[PDB]
Design a protein around this ligand. Structure first.
Ligand SMILES: [Zn+2]
Ligand SMILES: [Zn+2]
Lengths: 155, 20, 451, 145, 48
């Protein structure tokens, strides 16, 4: 953990003091990480989506920009993990909603079959698809795609 | 023997339309 | 025993589903090899493969066996990779029809469709929404048509009538623990739902193609020539030949109408020839053997359609020289009109219907690309508005209105929970359950909303 | 290298005329119409080969007494008694015949085949030298556009 | 030429109104504005 040049002296001594060292100088790193990283992941994702919401809904704030510069070290880890949708929420209000995107979901989306199906959908919707039912068929495509993604993931 | 009977067998089906 | 065999059959089915396309290409290559080694046959009333120093006669048999085996493997891997999707689509369609239109309640289907009649014995089964990631459809339709129609008259044809009565009764102090007996789950499995599923599978087009494929592969053992019909899979199967075959299958009706018009024009020329040109159709061999004449209408029509069309120079080159008096000019006109109207401007139509299809497909592709490069798919505002910030439109279509992001949001709403949704999530879920979609940004965005 | 071999044989100087195509850009407007699709043309000739092979196996299995290209009589040759020979005969004669294949074989006047072989010949004509050469000629016209 | 004529007819019917001839972009500010304008306000069937 010190050859990767990521942990400084303080971080190294902290991670060494946080070891089990139950008289044998041996640690079950499986339980160690499943104890110290599983809730850290969730709380860090929540902090990251909070900071992203603040940044996108309060720009031109240097007092927050200087905080974002030091929060970027953890904000980048959750970059391919949070989505952003612009929905029509309150009356005449474009609300930017955030959510989590699973690694399996972003893995089964880059498969060539799913990409080709999306290409064919865009093709035959731009060509002969209507306007009153564009979202009606888009949500059907989304449902079929997520079903086939679940099927390809459970195999 | 089907070079000549083929068209006759093809037209023999439209008798059900000729009756109506 | 049962567990150790189920956990193995599931793994085998997962392997067959993971390797569907690979086995497809392997079967194609095996058919290619079979047809390549079929080029070494001879006749003796007896077909013999005596063309090499051995190692070619038994390899054909083992290759045919391997081909039949791999065809069976493909036909059973299709049932595990693609059948769930089509049954999911069918269940989704029939459930949404029941909920939002009242098909089997107030709008009974007609006889011009078999799907509407075959989807009747599935709404009254127990496991009706087997693949719809939700089971609250019977409750929705019961609450929608419970007071306007018979409260029991709905559950009598939507199933669970006696089941819902027994559940309302068992809600009291009467509930046993159901036992599980091994090797006795045949009563547990639903036979009517499986019957409906098999009826849907045997109607699915892509399954009948694989069934015909396996049938021909089996007949290939009775005769080692039905393996030639497996080369049609390079056209009706993989999509490597679509750019070429679409030029022919795009018009389709135009080509058959063209050949019909050609047949009619040739029939007109045939009756004209039968009525005015007798002493010309004299295709005698060695002299004094008159044959293939125009003494019969059907014979003359077949002669025309078979020789004058393919002659490449009209019909005046396959009949006698029109030097006879009273016809020297009429038959010249006849021949030159046949030439100019049949093999000049009626084959040009066939060759132009193939050339126009290429241009039409290219225009469709260019229009798709232009619509994707000038407007947004969701809001549809335009490229010029977003092209005020440096690289604005691409950032808008990659961050703000990503179709992948919207699909992931729908997946998240479906798979997260029902009682854990936040305000916006609950609002979008309520809109989605009623299928309205005003939450999609119609003509506005976060940039048009603010400065 | 070819210019050097031209001294051992004064005919390798013919390969230097290919420089008018693979060299200067005065012929690009014409040669691009052919080299634009490229893959489409070879796929078309492959599909043509497959269709001709289908017709060849059909003929080998159902039409024996027709491929009788005898000269001077009583000299049977170039028959369909071999799969490879029949396939080469088809791909070499029926494609270039300009009128399908029914003009290079015997007259289909025999009973039990008078209609089946007429269908065979006319389908070969309409599918090989009508709508499979139209594809090749349309792939060159679409490239210009 | 015939295909181009058909495409031009479709484009002229999908981008402008037959009666006033204003344009699709102006009416495409209200959600589904142009189709409602051409189906309720300026219907040729209504004028007939
Ligand atoms: Zn947009
Ligand atoms: Zn108007």
């Amino acid at each position: 953990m010190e050859s990767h040049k990521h942990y400084t002296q303080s971080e190294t001594e902290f991670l060494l003091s946080c070891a089990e060292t139950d008289e044998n100088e041996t640690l079950d790193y499986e339980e160690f990480v499943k104890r110290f990283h599983e809730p850290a992941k969730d709380i860090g994702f929540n902090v990251a989506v909070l900071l992203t919401n603040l940044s996108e809904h309060m720009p031109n704030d240097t007092r927050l920009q200087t905080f974002l510069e030091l929060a970027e070290s953890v904000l980048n880890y959750f970059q391919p993990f949070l989505g952003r949708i612009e929905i029509m929420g309150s009356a005449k209000r474009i609300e930017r909603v955030y959510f989590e995107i699973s690694e399996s979901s972003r893995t089964q989306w880059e498969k060539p079959q799913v990409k080709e199906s999306k290409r064919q959908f865009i093709f035959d919707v731009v060509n002969e698809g209507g306007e009153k039912e564009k979202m009606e068929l888009f949500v059907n495509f989304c449902e079929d795609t997520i079903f086939e993604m679940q099927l390809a993931a459970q195999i | 023997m089907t070079v000549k009977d083929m068209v006759l067998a093809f037209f023999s089906s439209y008798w059900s339309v000729f009756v109506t | 025993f049962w567990k150790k065999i189920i956990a193995y059959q599931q793994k085998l089915l997962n392997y067959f589903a993971r390797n569907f396309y690979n086995m497809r290409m392997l079967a194609l290559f095996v058919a290619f090899a079979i047809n390549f080694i079929l080029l070494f046959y001879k006749v003796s009333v007896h077909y013999v493969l005596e063309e090499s120093s051995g190692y070619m006669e038994p390899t054909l048999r083992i290759l045919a066996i391997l081909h039949t085996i791999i065809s069976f493997f493909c036909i059973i891997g299709y049932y595990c990779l693609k059948v769930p999707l089509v049954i999911f689509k069918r269940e989704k369609e029939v459930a949404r029809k029941l909920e939002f239109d009242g098909l089997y309640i107030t709008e009974q289907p007609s006889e011009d469709d078999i799907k509407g009649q075959w989807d009747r014995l599935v709404i009254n089964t127990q496991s009706f929404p087997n693949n719809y990631w939700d089971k609250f459809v019977k409750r929705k339709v019961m609450d929608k048509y419970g007071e306007f129609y018979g409260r029991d008259r709905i559950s009598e044809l939507l199933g669970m009538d006696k089941a819902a009565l027994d559940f309302s009764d068992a809600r009291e102090k009467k509930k046993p623990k159901k036992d599980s007996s091994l090797s006795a789950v045949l009563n547990s499995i639903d036979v009517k739902y499986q019957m409906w599923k098999l009826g849907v599978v045997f109607t699915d087009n892509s399954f009948l193609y694989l069934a015909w494929y396996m049938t021909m592969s089996v007949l290939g053992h009775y005769n080692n020539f039905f393996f030639a019909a497996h080369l049609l899979d390079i056209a009706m199967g993989f999509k490597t030949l679509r750019t070429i075959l679409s030029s022919v299958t795009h018009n389709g009706k135009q080509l058959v109408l063209t050949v019909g018009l050609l047949a009619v024009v040739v029939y007109l020329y045939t009756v004209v020839a039968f009525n005015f040109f007798r002493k010309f159709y004299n295709k005698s061999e060695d002299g004094d053997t008159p044959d293939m004449k125009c003494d019969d209408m059907l014979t003359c029509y077949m002669f025309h359609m078979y020789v004058g069309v393919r002659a490449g120079g009209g019909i005046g080159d396959e009949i006698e020289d029109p030097a006879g008096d009273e016809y020297e000019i009429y038959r010249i006109i006849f021949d030159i009109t046949f030439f100019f109207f049949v093999i000049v401007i009626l084959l040009a139509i066939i060759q132009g219907l193939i050339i126009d299809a290429f241009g039409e497909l290219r225009d469709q592709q260019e229009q798709v690309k232009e619509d994707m490069e000038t407007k947004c798919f969701i809001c549809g505002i335009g490229n010029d508005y977003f092209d005020t910030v440096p690289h604005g439109f691409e950032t808008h279509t990659l961050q703000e209105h990503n179709l992948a992001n919207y699909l992931f949001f729908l997946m998240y709403l479906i798979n997260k929970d029902e009682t854990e949704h936040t305000g916006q999530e609950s609002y979008v879920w309520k809109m989605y359950q009623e299928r309205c979609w005003e939450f999609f940004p119609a003509g506005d965005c976060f940039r048009k909303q603010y400065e």
